[PDB]
């Protein structure tokens, strides 16, 4: 059996083939479904992996079967062999990179996967070579405000010793200061990461947005501090097309999201670090980042400025704010001259996506929760279309924290 | 730690582990290698004996007399009765448990904080499809009472061996016709297009506004379903207003009071009552955000932009989100007005978390489908969002079945 994947607006129905192809196992079972989670609940095991990707590559290439792939076996085969590991070709490194983003199941900008800029940084030697790297990408990424999709890869993991890493789980992110009374100034998400960043000698600001520095880990060695360049870090001031008092909270946000703690594996290669970026879906800042409680939580300061009833959930209060707080975003990048997609048309594109995938690999692994946006859900056209979460390889997961 | 699903709040950075998943017999749509979550509808003997037994258990326990005399006396008579009949039949009070738990189990229902407060009518003695449609009625009356909602099912004849099936062809007791035009769309209400037909075949002579209540097709064992219409004054319906904007009671919209689903299938300790419609009271979105803007439904997002003068040529105004709000709106407010009970997504789901919290301590976890129990506006402005559920089978259970023709 293969799922039948079913459009409830449509009437359409597909075949999901493509999972046949998952050799990972997710956290679900026949006894219960744990989709909704977050978090995961020897020499030929790699030499499977490295085949299966090689062999992954050349079919790409339509070179299948030729000489060329059967002497890149061979030399794969006879490195770990000898070594117990082997070593990417960069245009692998670039087929595996853009194949990893294809197959992120939570990711609704897929459409643009082919289009990624890599930056092959195995030739990394130190924390300063890391930052070197980093300024690198978040200049070309940005762009000015015309947002270019990049990955900088760092030298993989290696049986012998500790990883590279980057502390921060975001390239921008801004502090979070815990007060004597439990509450937090700036971003609670990252109280821990401002609270180390301190620790290994930064001078802290107060404010609601002040920019972190990176901590960069060589293998082996203490993280090091390193402030960004102001000027790398373009951010945009949030104010609303009508309402004046909105200017007035202060609000920004940045331009760049780059994730930058998770891990990249390639052909049973993993690449510790390896940060990524795109361009932002207005929703996370205007919903998650902007509303969520457990972040900067400013639907109930909106709602009085709105005038509105906070007295009682059945006036709206909250969806209304939600609502102008997201438009306030679209509004300040499109002012801004910053690209940002709001999510009618980044849901529209995503099943396009999902229809190219159909025809090009009988399949597509997506994960409904994440896909579907966070307001505003049953009025995209992604609600109404299942899909089936699986694990293929290259992929982006997630991996401890290093300290 | 613990070898169970742990399962995670993201606000409150609170774990829980889910124990009740154990007890799951009946098998999902998931493997270890594709998860399957977002599927609407992915597709005895000694077998009917241990659905029996485990029922029998669950009863006992409800009342705190397992391994009694009473227990074990009961257990034997229900081996008695499967053994020289091949089925057996329910106390009063056990149906009663096992409507309740039915409810109290069922993932997809963000309501169930109610699950204890359920009106069970027991109509197991009917006979005719006359008598089905005075049970229906009676149900329907007593469920309104006026506005202020009660819920309640009645549980008609268990499906017997060899007889035939008692069955309710509708979906729900209350739904509007869907006429199909000469030009491909469609007049009312598109989900009802196949049962407006289905009407019209067996003799119903159809309307032609965009809510037109639709008859009953009501089906006795062995006998073709007959067709009783709704007396107007039992389907309470409130007409839809905005409480500032003027116009739009002009639309002409209105929704009915009462959700009552009336083709599933509720399965007791192996029986089958294949009719036993249900009803309790709407939340808010179910009417304004998926029955009047799904596309595939009324869908009047683009009618309300325009009327609100918002620019519909572009994504990026969030012209939908905007409609989609004061619909909402529209319909919380217009539902207080009339004194008809409704509750709004964010009172909703936080009873959902409340509920969640009680069965932690009673059952040590939930079964619950995140997608379904998420609403379809505002989804991360509601607690629920943020809350990892596991879903699981448990039953009793209310199942879809095949449709009757
Ligand atoms: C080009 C514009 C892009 C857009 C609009 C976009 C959109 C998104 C969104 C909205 C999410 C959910 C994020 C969240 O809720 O925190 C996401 C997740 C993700 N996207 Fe993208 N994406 C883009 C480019 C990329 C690129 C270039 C990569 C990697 C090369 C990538 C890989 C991912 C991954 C791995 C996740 C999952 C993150 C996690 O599990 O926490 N995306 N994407
Ligand atoms: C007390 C008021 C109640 C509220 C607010 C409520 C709320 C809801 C909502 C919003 C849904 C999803 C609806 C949809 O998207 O189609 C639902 C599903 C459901 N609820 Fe309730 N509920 C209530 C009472 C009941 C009662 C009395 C029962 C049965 C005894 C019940 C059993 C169900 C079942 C079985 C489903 C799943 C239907 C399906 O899979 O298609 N609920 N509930
Ligand atoms: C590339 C990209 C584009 C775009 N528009 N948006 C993104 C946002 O991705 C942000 C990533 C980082 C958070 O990580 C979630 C998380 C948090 C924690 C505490 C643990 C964990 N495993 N995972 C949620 N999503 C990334
Ligand atoms: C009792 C109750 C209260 C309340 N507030 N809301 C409800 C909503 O239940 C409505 C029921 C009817 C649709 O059935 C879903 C469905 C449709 C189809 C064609 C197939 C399928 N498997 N499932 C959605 N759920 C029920
Ligand atoms: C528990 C639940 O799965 C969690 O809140 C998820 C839901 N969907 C999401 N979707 C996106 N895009 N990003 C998220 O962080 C989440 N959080
Ligand atoms: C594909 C997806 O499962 C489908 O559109 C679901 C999503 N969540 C839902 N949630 C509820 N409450 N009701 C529904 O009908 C649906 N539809
Ligand atoms: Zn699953």
Redesign the pocket.
Known sequence: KFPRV?N?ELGSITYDTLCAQSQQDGPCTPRRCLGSLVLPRPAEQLLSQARDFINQYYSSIKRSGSQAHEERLQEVEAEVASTGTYHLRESELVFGAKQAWRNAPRCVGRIQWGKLQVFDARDCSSAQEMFTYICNHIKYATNRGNLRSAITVFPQRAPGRGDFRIWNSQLVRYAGYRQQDGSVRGDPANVEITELCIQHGWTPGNGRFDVLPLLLQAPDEAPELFVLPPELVLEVPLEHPTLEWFAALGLRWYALPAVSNMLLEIGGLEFSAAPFSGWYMSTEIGTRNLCDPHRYNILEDVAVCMDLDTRTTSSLWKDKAAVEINLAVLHSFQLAKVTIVDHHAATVSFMKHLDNEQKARGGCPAD?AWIVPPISG?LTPV?????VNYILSPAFRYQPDPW
């Open positions: 079913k409830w409904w049953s609600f109404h279309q299942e899909m």
